[PDB]
Each structure stands twice: as C-alpha cells, then as structure tokens.
Design a protein around this ligand. Structure first.
Ligand SMILES: *[C@@H]1O[C@H](CO)[C@@H](O[C@@H]2O[C@H](CO)[C@@H](O)[C@H](O)[C@H]2NC(C)=O)[C@H](O)[C@H]1NC(C)=O
Ligand SMILES: *[C@@H]1O[C@H](CO)[C@@H](O[C@@H]2O[C@H](CO)[C@@H](O)[C@H](O)[C@H]2NC(C)=O)[C@H](O)[C@H]1NC(C)=O
Ligand SMILES: *[C@@H]1O[C@H](CO)[C@@H](O[C@@H]2O[C@H](CO)[C@@H](O)[C@H](O)[C@H]2NC(C)=O)[C@H](O)[C@H]1NC(C)=O
Ligand SMILES: *[C@@H]1O[C@H](CO)[C@@H](O[C@@H]2O[C@H](CO)[C@@H](O)[C@H](O)[C@H]2NC(C)=O)[C@H](O)[C@H]1NC(C)=O
Ligand SMILES: *[C@@H]1O[C@H](CO)[C@@H](O)[C@H](O)[C@H]1NC(C)=O
Ligand SMILES: *[C@@H]1O[C@H](CO)[C@@H](O)[C@H](O)[C@H]1NC(C)=O
Ligand SMILES: *[C@@H]1O[C@H](CO)[C@@H](O)[C@H](O)[C@H]1NC(C)=O
Ligand SMILES: *[C@@H]1O[C@H](CO)[C@@H](O)[C@H](O)[C@H]1NC(C)=O
Ligand SMILES: *[C@@H]1O[C@H](CO)[C@@H](O)[C@H](O)[C@H]1NC(C)=O
Ligand SMILES: *[C@@H]1O[C@H](CO)[C@@H](O)[C@H](O)[C@H]1NC(C)=O
Ligand SMILES: *[C@@H]1O[C@H](CO)[C@@H](O)[C@H](O)[C@H]1NC(C)=O
Ligand SMILES: *[C@@H]1O[C@H](CO)[C@@H](O)[C@H](O)[C@H]1NC(C)=O
Ligand SMILES: *[C@@H]1O[C@H](CO)[C@@H](O)[C@H](O)[C@H]1NC(C)=O
Ligand SMILES: *[C@@H]1O[C@H](CO)[C@@H](O)[C@H](O)[C@H]1NC(C)=O
Lengths: 149, 142, 246, 239, 50, 50
C-alpha cells in the first residue's frame, strides 16, 4: 500500500496520485487571489483574474485549506487499514489484515477457507492493479471532464 | 357531465354580512338571491353556502380546508341528489388484544402484482429571437 | 427485543440474562431528552428559519411600494388629479412597469424555495418508511452505531425522530491465530475467531466475550496442515468419546 | 447584548496601504485608531486589526477565512482573540502481527434528529396591489395582457403541492390502532411518549414541550373585519 | 408532462396580440403612418414588452 | 439593474444541482467506506470488497 499512503519526503504530505490529480486539472490562474499591489504592473501574464476587480466583482478564499483536507483524508485510510469497519461506531479496535479480508469474503457467500489457501496468489494480482491506475490517468485527459466544467 | 348545482365559499368572513361581504345589492338578482343564505355553514376557513351539514363520516373527494370535505350524494333523501359537506374520517377503528404469553403464526400465503409509473424525460424545443421579435422588418433588423 | 438483537451478531442468549440491567439503562436514557432539548437555545433552529424567511420576504414587498421609479410622485391619485391625459399615460407606464417587474422576483424565489423543501420532505419520507417500520443495516444512515428501534414525534411544520442505539464500551487484548492443526488435518471455525489467554484456546462471538470449549460440533475441515501461514498445533475434543466408552 | 468591542478586517489588501485613510482627509469612513496599528495580523484574505494572537488552539466558533477563527473569552479583563483552527483530538493504534481486541460489556444510547416537512401557504391579489382602488388604473392595466392570469396558477402549484407533501409523509398505514388499557411491558417504561389521557388535548409530554419552544406567526382567522379599528388602533403588522 | 408544456407553448403566442399601450399592435402600421423621428417613442414599448 | 438580476437567478439554480451531488457523495462516504454494502452495483461493478 505504498502508492496511496502519504510520503513524509514530500513538502506538504500529498500522495503521489494526488500530485497527478492536481497537475492534470488546470485552474483559472496559478494563484487563487491577486492582491492589491500585485496587479499594479501590467505584466503579460495578468489575465482577467484582477482586471475585473475594479468593477466590484470579487472572489473569496474558502474556509478549509487543502492541507487540512489532506490531513482529514489520510485519517480514513489510516483507520480502514488498521481497524476494519468497527471504528465508525465507537472505540477503535485493532485486528490483523488477513482476517479482515477473510471477513470480507465471508460477507458475500464464499467460505473463508478459500482465502487462506491462495493468499500469495491474491497479492501478486492486487499490486498489479494499483500500479496500472497511474497509466490510466495519463493516457488521455478525458477522464476528469466534469471537474473542468 | 352530471348536474348543474354549485356551491359558493367565502373566505375568512363572519358572513353574517354576506350582503356586505359582496355588495350584491347592486349586482344581478340571481346573485342577490344566492346571497340570501338559504342554509349556511361555518368553518374555520370561512363559510359555505349551498350545502347541508351531515353527521356521517366518509373518505372525501374535494378538499375544502380545516379538515372538511364535500361531495355529491343521493341516498340522504328519498331519492333529489344534492351536494353535502362533512368532516373527513381516517379509516376503520381496530385493535389487537396484546397478551404477554401468546403469539400468532400464518399458515397460508398468496402472491400479488403491483404497478409503478415514472416520467423519464420531457420534449425538446428551440426558439429563434430575431424572427419572433419583429417578423421580417428591416427597421427592426437595425 | 431478542429478535432485534439477533440481527447484528449478538447471540439470542445475551438478552435473557441481563434483562433488568437493560431496562434500567433504557429508562435512564429516556429520562435525559427533556434536559437535552431544553439545554441549547438552538435546538429547533432548523425549523425556526423556515418560518422566518416566509415571514420576512413578504414584509419587504410592502416596503417596496414606496419607490417612485423615476416619476414625479409615489401616490397614484396625485398624477391623475394634477396633470392631463396626453402625458399622464407616459407618467403611469413607469410605475406600472416597475411594480409588475417587482412582483415576479417574489414569485421566482417562492418557486425555488418550494423546490428545495420538496426534496427535504422526500428524504424525510424515506427515513420514515425505512427506519421505524423494520430494521436497517446501512451504517450511519439512522443514528450513530448499530440500530435497534425508532420513534417519531410531530412538531410545527416538521418531525423529530428518536433513535435507539447499541454501543460496545470496554475492550480487552488477546492473542489470536488464523486456523488450528491436528493429526495432519486443519480445522477452521464455523463462526467467530480463536482466542487464547496464554493458557488454553477457545472460540467466541465477534461482539461479546463468551468463551466455549473447542469441539468438532462448531468447526469444520478443509485442506491440510501445510499451506496456511501462522498455524499452530493443538488438541481437538470429540463429544462421542466419553459416551462410547461404555 | 454582552459587550461593545469591535474588530475590523480589510479585504484582500496589504494593510501597509491602509494608513492612507485619514480622519481629516476627504473620505466617508475616517476612523482613527483602526487605520494605524498597535497589534495587527495578516491573512491570505486580507488584514486584521483589533485582534490579539494566541497559539493555544480551540474548536473555533465564528469563521473568517484561510483557516483563522475569532472568539471572545476571558483571557486577561477580556478581549477578542484570533487563532488557527484545531483539527481535533489525536490517538494511536497498536498494530501487530497476531493481536486482537474484543469488547466485554455494552451500553445503550438514544439520539435526536429534526427535519422540516412543509412551508406556509400564501396568496396574492393582482389588481389591488397594483392599482389600489383607482378607477382608470384598471382600464390602463387591462391592455398589458395576461400576467394576472398566470401568476395565480404559478402560486396555486405550490398551494396544492404543500398538502400532497404532508399527506404522503404521514399516511403509510391505513388502519388506526390504539394501545391496550394496561401499560405493563415486562420492565420498560413508555410513559413519556404515549399520549396522556389527563390532558384536555390528545398530546404527549415531549410534543407539549416542543410546541412552546417555537414562536409561530400570528393566525386564527376567527374574526378579522374591523379588528384594527378599535383597541388595535396601534396597528399590528398582520392587518 | 405532455400537457403542461404544450400549454406553456400556446400562451406565448397569445401575448403577441397585446398592444402594450402603443398605438396599434401590428408592427407595419406604425411605420406606414407616423414619421421616422417619432416612431422610436413607440417601438421601444413593444420591444421591451416582448 | 436588469443585467445584474438575471445573473443572480442563474447562480441560484446551479447551486441546487451542486448540492444534489454533494449530498449524494456523503452517503457514498458512509456506506461504501466504513462498512460493506449489499446494494447491487451501488459502488463499482460486480461484488464489493473495499
Ligand atoms: C391457501 O389458499 C388458497 C386460496 O388461493 C387455496 O387454494 C385453493 O384451494 C381450494 C381448495 O381445494 C381449491 O378448490 C382451489 O382451486 C385453490 N385455488 C384457488 C385459486 O382458489 C389453498 O388450498 C390454501 N392452502 C391449503 C394448504 O389448503
Ligand atoms: C457494564 O458496565 C456497567 C457500567 O456502565 C455496569 O453496570 C452496573 O450496574 C449495576 C446495577 O445497575 C450498578 O449498581 C453499577 O453501579 C453499574 N456499574 C457502574 C460502574 O456504575 C456493569 O458492570 C455492566 N452492565 C451490563 C448491563 O453489562
Ligand atoms: C489493549 O490494546 C489497546 C489498544 O491497542 C492498548 O491501548 C493503548 O496501547 C498503546 C500502545 O502503543 C499505549 O501506548 C496506550 O497507553 C494504550 N492505552 C491508551 C488509552 O491509548 C492497551 O494498552 C492494551 N492493553 C490494555 C490492558 O488495554
Ligand atoms: C416512567 O418514567 C417517568 C419519568 O421517568 C415516571 O414519571 C415520573 O415519576 C416520578 C416519580 O419517581 C415523578 O416525580 C415525576 O413527576 C414523573 N414524571 C412524569 C413526567 O410523569 C413514571 O413514574 C415511570 N413509570 C413507572 C411505572 O415507573
Ligand atoms: C365570527 O365567527 C366566530 C366563529 O367562532 C365567532 O366566534 C364570532 O363571534 C363571529 N363574529 C361575530 C361578530 O359574530
Ligand atoms: C348531529 O351531531 C350534533 C353534534 O353532536 C348533534 O347536536 C345533532 O343533534 C346531531 N344530529 C342528529 C340528527 O342526530
Ligand atoms: C387469537 O387471539 C387474538 C388475541 O390475541 C384474538 O383477537 C383472536 O380472535 C384469536 N383468534 C381467533 C380465531 O379467535
Ligand atoms: C403477564 O401479564 C399478567 C397480567 O398482568 C401478569 O400477571 C403476569 O405476571 C405477566 N407475565 C409475566 C411473566 O410477568
Ligand atoms: C486462562 O484461562 C484458564 C481457564 O481455566 C485459567 O486456568 C488460566 O489461569 C488463564 N491464564 C491466564 C494467563 O489468564
Ligand atoms: C506442531 O505439532 C506438529 C505435530 O503434528 C509438528 O509437526 C509441528 O512441527 C509443530 N509445530 C510447532 C511450531 O511446534
Ligand atoms: C442579555 O444579557 C443578559 C445579561 O448579560 C441576560 O440576562 C439576557 O438573557 C441576555 N439576553 C438574551 C436575549 O438572552
Ligand atoms: C506587503 O507589504 C510589506 C511591507 O509592509 C512587504 O514586505 C510585502 O512584500 C508586501 N506583500 C504584498 C503581497 O504586497
Ligand atoms: C506563538 O508562537 C510564535 C512562534 O513560535 C512565537 O513567536 C510567539 O511568541 C508565540 N506567542 C506567545 C504569546 O508566546
Ligand atoms: C510480522 O511478520 C513478518 C513476516 O511474516 C515479519 O517480517 C515482521 O517482522 C513481523 N512483525 C511483528 C511485529 O511480529
């Protein structure tokens, strides 16, 4: 699971997939805001972001910055991988991963004796899927159409 | 498609001033005599003229307000079908005898079929501005 | 109540041995609702605003009536008494257009607000149909934790639901193993997991500590003692042995 | 109702420019102390004047922006404070290879949820609001078309849907039942939710406590004509 | 669904008949009777009304 | 004035749609994460694990 957990080496604790997701989508401008003294000089890069500020139309920053969003969303991955589903009800309870997967198979009408008999076969498949997804987000930019509109 | 009689409702009035609630003393004689109040009824939402109040109870067809309804009946009199208004009734009153050491169990079952309907889409339309706004006049085109 | 418990993993035998300690706890929990509602002034805010909006916009509309819209006066009788027909129409048209345009804003805003309330009522209808007339396993859809029962109550332009929930409180550590080994065969448990206190081994339910003795009447057999990882050797009991020794 | 202090936020400007405003200068807002600075802060949303920064983190009450919140508490005898948000309490999990944890005792709780179901009905009269009993105003109005023809339908749509909502929510059962005359149930106690016979109205204590916690608008319509002519000469908003 | 929309399309035709306080509803009469300097006082009302 | 009001109206409508999506996502956060779901093809295709 090293492809979806935060990397301490990165400056702002963002997962590798999140970097591709941010960079694929383009915003209206590199910066959310253009301060009062930023647009004094008519640099060619100055688009309609601050030319309309003289007419009373303004934008405001949101409440939760992206770093706090990352801190929230890492907690869910930390909880699910180490405690199953029980932490959505009360006190958290630890439990090793393989028995959690055995419970998951037992959920859908397959006796658990399958899992313990083919464990090493499943891993070599699972790790192949995740490593593919990155390519699936770099072949074409047509996947994220909605977030553009 | 059935008859001709109608009933009139005045909203939010002590219609003891029905000649004054509408100044019918200057209107046609027909409204004048429909304002005489042959038999009036009082409701929280106003008053009703042209119907009789009944002590029975039924599920109702035409909503009127404040839990009253009105419909068209024939069995009230000897024949002379007329409009009546009454308080709506919820349904049959039933009870189950609860007891702390006895239950009930079914023995026979049955199968039913039921229907449901849903809209999925509306028709598609388009409009032209210039042709509709004036309709072939060059002065409008300018 | 026993059948309600049976649907979330707790065995039927738990309730019949702890009846009074559940009745008292339920009564104590019910006793706190009055204070809970009376504590915070914003208990019913979600309803209050619904009134206030529709008791406020109308007022603004009346205050709208004072605009002259670029005419020479506000009241209408002055325009009729003070001036002459050949331009009185020009004077009136401004006021009529202004007011006729003003009313449409109120109409449109009422449409949008009603459109929102329709969806909210539909969601409430689903909650009423699914979580008081049965039992739902959708986590966090009704209440926090697991779900047992619900009760509805009415209020001006709305409803309030009371949900009853079950929550584990105190937990203990244990050492576990995935499967057990005996005479070359491997045994798996039919339900629950193997728990050992450092001295012996037992099986138990997944949500309430209740040890039993391992037998052949609650396990089964598959594979062989070679492939599974972490398996541990131990003994197996047979119920027919002490009965067939006669 | 509590205090009288204030704080000011200038939107999205480097507040070194703020000292441009001067009380004697030609300008409508000409406040003195807030133009200069004795304790100032800078946020991505602008500049904050009048606040005191504190590093201790609390669950914040009112929002400002860029993850900064303000509050009022007895610091030192009290003044407003601004701070960065606190995400929440933290914990840790002792993961292992072959360790499990199971519960041993259970507790029961009850929770409350609230939902709106409809909105008040309304109606308007087209001609009276636009002419006010003028004579030829009606003649001048009759030419403009059919606005008054379709506004009534537009409102009647809501006026008829607002009852369909309530009829659909509360009618999932046909018959009407009633509780047995004896209220014994093996140990439990439902006396706080069942209707109380002693009350003159068929209601229950929780509903009774609910009804008095919301200020419903005036209504009743039992008699209306001439009310604001007499003792209500001090006109009320309703009439 | 088939009904309402149809009605919402019929009324838009009928509004083409109202005069909006002008001299006449037909758009050619104004240009065939008045003069260019003053027809602009009238055409504006019809344009806004539609 | 007119050119302002129209803009606002459009915004309001769009707001509703976005909420109609966000209120969906919350449910998918609490039924396909933090627990297993037996609703057919509510999340993904085929049976669901994680
Ligand atoms: C359960 O009820 C059904 C009614 O639908 C019974 O079916 C009928 O039984 C009678 C009695 O022999 C037959 O004459 C009919 O032809 C059956 N069908 C219908 C449609 O009426 C059924 O017998 C009942 N169950 C049992 C065990 O008797
Ligand atoms: C679970 O723990 C509870 C504590 O929450 C215990 O309940 C005790 O109940 C008796 C009888 O009502 C009281 O006299 C004790 O005071 C309670 N304990 C405490 C700490 O207050 C009990 O150990 C367990 N109860 C159940 C139902 O499992
Ligand atoms: C049982 O397990 C729990 C949870 O794994 C343990 O609780 C914490 O374990 C960590 C291990 O790093 C300790 O640092 C904490 O002090 C423990 N307590 C709390 C409140 O966090 C617990 O220690 C284990 N044993 C018992 C007897 O509960
Ligand atoms: C059920 O519970 C209610 C409330 O907990 C009990 O009613 C209260 O009883 C106490 C006596 O201990 C009185 O002082 C209160 O005034 C009562 N309040 C209300 C609202 O009735 C009720 O007695 C309990 N029923 C049983 C059978 O014990
Ligand atoms: C108007 O009707 C109400 C209905 O209860 C009644 O109480 C009231 O006395 C009536 N008013 C007059 C003036 O009769
Ligand atoms: C109808 O009910 C009312 C109210 O109880 C009663 O006064 C009246 O006498 C009843 N009419 C008949 C015919 O029984
Ligand atoms: C079964 O018992 C109920 C009361 O619990 C009673 O109403 C019913 O009549 C009984 N069944 C028959 C066939 O009498
Ligand atoms: C069942 O109800 C009766 C009537 O009150 C009562 O005498 C009896 O004790 C109850 N049964 C039990 C097991 O409590
Ligand atoms: C484990 O449980 C058995 C049950 O008989 C007991 O004899 C033994 O002392 C317990 N050991 C520990 C370490 O708790
Ligand atoms: C457990 O016992 C079996 C005897 O059937 C033995 O073959 C195996 O090596 C033992 N394992 C350990 C870890 O002692
Ligand atoms: C206003 O403050 C006073 C005392 O600080 C308090 O008694 C009063 O309740 C407050 N007003 C409201 C509406 O709560
Ligand atoms: C704001 O002004 C300070 C000087 O008071 C300067 O150091 C800083 O770079 C300025 N920042 C911006 C964004 O204008
Ligand atoms: C808050 O933290 C900053 C950074 O460490 C420090 O400069 C400042 O003095 C602290 N505040 C107080 C009141 O000590
Ligand atoms: C868990 O087991 C793996 C191999 O199965 C081993 O590499 C790791 O060190 C073990 N960790 C602990 C805490 O026992």
């Amino acid at each position: 699971f090293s492809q979806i957990l935060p990397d301490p080496s990165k400056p702002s604790k963002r997962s590798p997939i999140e970097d591709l997701l941010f960079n694929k989508v383009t915003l209206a401008d590199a910066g959310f805001i253009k301060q009062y003294g930023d647009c004094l000089g008519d640099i060619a890069a100055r688009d309609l972001i601050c030319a309309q500020k003289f007419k009373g139309l303004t934008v405001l920053p949101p409440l939760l910055t992206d770093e706090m969003i990352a801190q929230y969303t890492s907690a869910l991955l930390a909880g699910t991988i180490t405690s199953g589903w029980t932490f959505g009800a009360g006190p958290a309870l630890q439990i090793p991963f393989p028995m959690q997967m055995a419970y998951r198979f037992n959920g859908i009408g397959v006796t658990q004796n399958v899992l313990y008999e083919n464990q090493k076969l499943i891993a070599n498949q699972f790790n192949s899927a995740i490593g593919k997804i990155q390519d699936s987000l770099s072949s074409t930019p047509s996947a994220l159409g909605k977030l553009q509109d | 498609n059935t008859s001709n009689q109608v009933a009139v409702l005045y909203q939010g009035v002590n219609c003891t001033e029905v000649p004054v609630a509408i100044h019918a003393d200057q209107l046609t004689p027909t409204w004048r005599v429909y304002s005489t109040g042959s038999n009036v009824f009082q409701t929280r939402a106003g008053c009703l003229i042209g119907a009789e109040y009944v002590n029975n109870s039924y599920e109702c067809d035409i909503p009127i307000g404040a839990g009253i309804c009105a419909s068209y009946q024939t069995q009230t009199k000897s024949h002379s079908q007329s409009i009546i208004a009454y308080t709506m009734s919820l349904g049959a009153e039933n009870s189950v005898a609860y007891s702390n050491n006895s239950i009930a169990i079914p023995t026979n079952f049955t199968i039913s079929v039921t229907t449901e309907i849903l809209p999925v889409s509306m028709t598609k339309t388009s409009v032209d501005c210039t042709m509709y706004i004036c309709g072939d006049s060059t002065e409008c085109s300018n | 109540m026993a059948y309600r418990f049976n649907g979330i993993g707790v065995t039927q035998n738990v309730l019949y041995e702890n009846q009074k300690l559940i009745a008292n706890q339920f009564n104590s929990a019910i006793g706190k609702i009055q204070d809970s509602l009376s504590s915070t002034p914003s208990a019913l805010g979600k309803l209050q605003d619904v009134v206030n909006h529709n008791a406020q916009a109308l007022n603004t509309l009346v205050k709208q009536l004072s605009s002259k819209f670029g005419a020479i006066s506000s009241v209408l009788n002055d325009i009729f008494s003070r001036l002459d027909p050949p331009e009185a129409e020009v004077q009136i048209d401004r006021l009529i257009t202004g007011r006729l345009q003003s009313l449409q804003t109120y109409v449109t805003q009422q449409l949008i607000r009603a459109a929102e309330i329709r969806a909210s009522a539909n969601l409430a209808a689903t909650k009423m149909s699914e979580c008081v007339l049965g039992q739902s396993k959708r986590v966090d859809f009704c209440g926090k934790g697991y779900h047992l029962m619900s009760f509805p109550q009415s209020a001006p332009h709305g409803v309030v639901f009371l949900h009853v929930t079950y929550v584990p409180a105190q937990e203990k550590n244990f050492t576990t193993a995935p499967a057990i080994c005996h005479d070359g065969k491997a045994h798996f448990p039919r339900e629950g997991v193997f728990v050992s206190n450092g001295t012996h081994w037992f099986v138990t339910q997944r949500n309430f500590y209740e040890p039993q003795i391992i037998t052949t009447d609650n396990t089964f057999v598959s594979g062989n003692c070679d492939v599974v990882i972490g398996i541990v050797n131990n003994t197996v009991y047979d119920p027919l042995q002490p009965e067939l020794d006669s | 109702n509590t205090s009288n202090q204030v704080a000011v936020l200038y939107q999205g400007v480097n507040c070194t420019e703020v000292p441009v405003a001067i009380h004697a200068d030609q300008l409508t807002p000409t406040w003195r102390v807030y133009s200069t600075g004795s304790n100032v802060f800078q946020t991505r949303a602008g500049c904050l004047i009048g606040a005191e920064y504190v590093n201790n983190s609390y669950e914040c009450d009112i929002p400002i922006g860029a993850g900064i919140c303000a509050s009022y508490q007895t610091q030192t005898s009290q003044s407003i404070i601004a701070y960065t948000m606190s995400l929440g309490a933290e914990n840790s999990v002792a993961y292992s290879n072959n360790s499990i944890a199971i519960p041993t005792n259970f507790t029961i709780s009850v929770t409350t949820e609230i939902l709106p179901v409809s909105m008040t009905k309304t109606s308007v009269d087209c001609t009276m609001y636009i002419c006010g009993d003028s004579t030829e105003c009606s003649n001048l109005l009759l030419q403009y078309g059919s606005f008054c023809t379709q506004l009534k339908r537009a409102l009647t749509g809501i006026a008829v849907e607002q009852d369909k909502n309530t009829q659909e929510v509360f009618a999932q059962v046909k018959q009407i039942y009633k509780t047995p005359p004896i209220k014994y149930f093996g140990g439990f106690n439902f006396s706080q939710i069942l209707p109380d016979p002693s009350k003159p109205s068929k209601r229950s204590p929780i509903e009774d406590l609910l009804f008095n916690k919301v200020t419903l608008a005036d209504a009743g319509f039992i008699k209306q004509y001439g009310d604001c002519l007499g003792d209500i000469a001090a006109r009320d908003l309703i009439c």
